[PDB]
Amino acid sequence: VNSFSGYLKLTDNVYIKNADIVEEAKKVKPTVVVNAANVYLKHGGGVAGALNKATNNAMQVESDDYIATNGPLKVGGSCVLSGHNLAKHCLHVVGPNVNKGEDIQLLKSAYENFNQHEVLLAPLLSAGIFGADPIHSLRVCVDTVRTNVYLAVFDKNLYDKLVSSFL
């Protein structure tokens, strides 16, 4: 039993809710919140911009030190950093950005990072400003993630479409 509330159950391990991931993390304080990161951990917009703003830019400060030490992530890769005031940890995961021409096949590799954590609060990878089809992102999530994932979808119209079209 966990404290995630109001989710629809899609499969044995995947749950979904029309919610603002910033507000969900602030309420639940999950062990792991997933950020929709880029390889430079430049948290400018979309989910990353919102998560970072909620940390008063502390996420960006920590991320800049991480990049200065380690260099950029790989598309499809991830790193674990602090969750600041939102969660114990933040798993920064890089899904492919379609508006950069990146290989959508890398979306499965991106979701594989979730399997290293027993429970996560997450957005749909490569959705929003990353330019992929969210119905496809949900499909890849369900077919790749085996650990317990709680998906927050900001847009109510999209959530209904994802639910209604979910096979």
Ligand X SMILES: Cc1cc2c(=O)n(CCN3C(=O)c4ccccc4S3(=O)=O)nnc2s1
- Region of 24-32, 52-60, 101-109, 123-131 interacting with ligand X (CB under 6 A): 123-131
CA-closest candidate to residue 166, choices 144, 145, 137: 137
Which residue, 23 or 64, is less far from ligand X as judged by CB?
A: 23
CB 145 within 8 A of CB 14: yes
C-beta atoms surrounding 83 within 10 Å: 22
131 binds ligand X (CB under 6 A): no
| Residue 45, phi then psi, degrees to nearest 5 | -160, 180
CB 104 within 8 A of CB 141: no
Distance (Å, whole) CA 117 – CA 148: 8
154 binds ligand X (CB under 6 A): yes
Distance (Å, whole) CA 167 – CA 148: 19
Which residue, 47 or 79, is less far from ligand X as judged by CB?
A: 47
Binding footprint of ligand X, residue count (CB under 6 A): 14
Which residue, 78 or 130, is less far from ligand X as judged by CB?
A: 130
30 binds ligand X (CB under 6 A): no
Which residue, 76 or 128, is less far from ligand X as judged by CB?
A: 128
CB 159 to ligand X: min, Å: 7
Residues numbered 42-101 forming contacts with ligand X, rule: CB under 6 A: 46-47, 50
127 binds ligand X (CB under 6 A): yes
Q: DSSP for 53-88?
A: HHTTTHHHHHHHHHHHHH-PPPTT-EEEEE-TTT-S
Write out the residues near ligand X by the rule CB under 6 A.
20-21, 46-47, 50, 123-124, 127-128, 134, 153-155, 158
